[PDB]
Design a protein around this ligand. Structure first.
Ligand code: B1T
Length: 461
């Protein structure tokens, strides 16, 4: 069976949630279901980005990083898939997976996901980045009501998952230390508490898993085969040798037209063998504009949907002008966040002046959008790693770096304004009075960010 059709290559970049959906044309588009989520984080990892940016890597830093990374991540991906999960999203050291089930099946599916989780922890026992650096994971699990939001325009589409269970999975992840599997309160509440030994987490309703202790006669394999009965797209029969049913997709112009919109133009070029398969693995100077939109209530897709859609329409317009691109959209703890990048796009002059001006315009327009309570934008510039991360059958373009995290942290620790780093400040070729120098705040993940600035803009206001 031939399987290397462009449609199949495109679907590698997408979860089944999109690949096998049937969305109306309307934007936004909302859908509601139940399932279990797994949010996975790899340790020892800001440490790698540093290792690999050093001159010791002789200009093959991006290459070696992408390699060592995919080696470990693609092992995580195979597990998730074999355990019947759908990998929703990657970014950096982290990936999100979903086992979408009917509400009666949640209890049993939780047991699968827990087992999957302990097997992931077992991959990395006795396992190091380098001599003297352990690689470990932290896993958060959640279960419940989940909303999909799809937004975009006629040529580009994005999705997010929303709701308290998504919020719960992020909270369980943040609590988790290395080697932990943390359950949300609702996940603990819905699980088969006869099989699952836990301990409490101080100042938290969430729980940590110690052991999976099934009864004397329980057979995990037969229990899992019974759970696959409820999985629409688990590969089987003649296709039981395959990690994803998506690998059997056949040409279909309409579906391809739909899917390609989720994928960046430079990936499509590569998919089409019109660009070298290695061209995207790089260390490149870019400017990151990280835009955060806070809402009164970030679990109600009917509320935040239209606003995200409205904001997207503007952001995409302002970026086409100023020569940037949306790379990924995120739901953090607080808000919807757009990860925008200038430079790797064309490497253009006035990149910095343009990134700033583009931020202020986004900021002004978005602050006037109905349900948006607050807008926050962080702007940082520097060398970041770019590349396609994951498995052959499931992978996504991502950006990784101290500057990516710096912009992400600025927009959280300096809400309501546009902030920029020193690189951006000094290389802007704008007058100093378009800025204010800010209080130095201590920020999670960041060591000597350097002086930070508010982009005040042209007038006194
Ligand atoms: O901050 C994130 C990183 Cl580093 C990786 C991934 Cl896969 C996701 C997030 S935030 C986020 C979390 C959930 Cl639970 C769902 C969505 Cl739609 C997100 O963007």
């Amino acid at each position: 069976e031939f399987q290397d059709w462009p449609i199949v290559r495109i679907a590698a970049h997408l979860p089944d949630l999109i690949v096998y959906g049937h969305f109306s044309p309307e934007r936004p588009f909302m859908d509601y279901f139940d399932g279990v989520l797994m949010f996975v984080d790899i340790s020892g990892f800001t440490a790698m980005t540093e290792k690999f940016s050093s001159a010791m890597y002789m200009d093959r830093g991006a290459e070696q990083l992408v390699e060592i990374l995919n080696y470990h991540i693609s092992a995580i991906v195979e597990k998730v898939l074999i355990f019947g999960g759908d990998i929703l999203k990657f970014a950096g050291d982290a990936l999100l997976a979903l086992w979408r089930v009917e509400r009666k099946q949640l209890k049993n599916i939780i047991t699968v996901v827990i087992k999957c989780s302990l097997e992931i922890h077992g991959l990395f026992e006795t396992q190091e980045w380098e001599e003297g650096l352990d690689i470990r994971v932290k896993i958060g699990l959640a279960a419940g009501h989940i909303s999909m939001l799809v937004f975009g325009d006629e040529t580009h589409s994005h999705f997010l998952v929303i709701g308290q269970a998504v919020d719960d999975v992020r909270l369980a992840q943040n609590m988790a230390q290395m080697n932990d599997v943390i359950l949300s309160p609702n996940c603990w509440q819905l699980c088969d508490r006869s099989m699952i030994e836990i301990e409490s987490v101080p100042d938290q309703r969430a729980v940590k898993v110690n052991f999976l202790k099934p009864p004397p006669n329980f057979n995990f394999d037969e229990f899992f085969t019974k759970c696959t009965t409820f999985m629409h797209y688990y590969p089987s029969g003649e296709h039981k040798n395959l990690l994803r049913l998506a690998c059997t997709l056949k040409p279909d112009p309409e579906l391809e037209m739909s899917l390609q919109k989720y994928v960046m133009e430079s990936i499509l070029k590569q998919i089409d063998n019109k660009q070298l398969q290695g061209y995207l693995s790089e260390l490149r100077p870019v400017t990151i504009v990280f835009v955060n939109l806070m809402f009164e209530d970030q679990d109600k897709a009917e509320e935040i949907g239209p606003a995200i859609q409205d904001a997207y329409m503007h952001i995409t317009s302002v970026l086409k002008i100023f020569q940037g691109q949306i790379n990924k959209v995120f739901m953090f703890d607080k808000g919807c966040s757009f990860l925008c990048v200038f430079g790797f796009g064309e490497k253009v002059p006035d990149e910095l002046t343009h990134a700033l001006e583009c931020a202020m315009d986004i900021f002004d327009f978005c602050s006037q959008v109905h349900k948006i309570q607050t807008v926050s934008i962080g702007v940082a510039s520097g060398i970041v790693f770019c590349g396609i991360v994951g498995h052959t059958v499931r992978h996504e373009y991502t950006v990784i770096g101290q500057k990516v995290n710096l912009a992400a942290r600025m927009m959280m620790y300096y809400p309501g304004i546009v902030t920029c780093d020193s690189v951006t400040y000094n290389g802007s070729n704008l007058p100093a009075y378009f800025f204010k120098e800010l209080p130095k705040k201590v920020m999670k993940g960041v060591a000597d960010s350097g002086p930070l600035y508010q982009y005040w803009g042209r007038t006194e206001k």
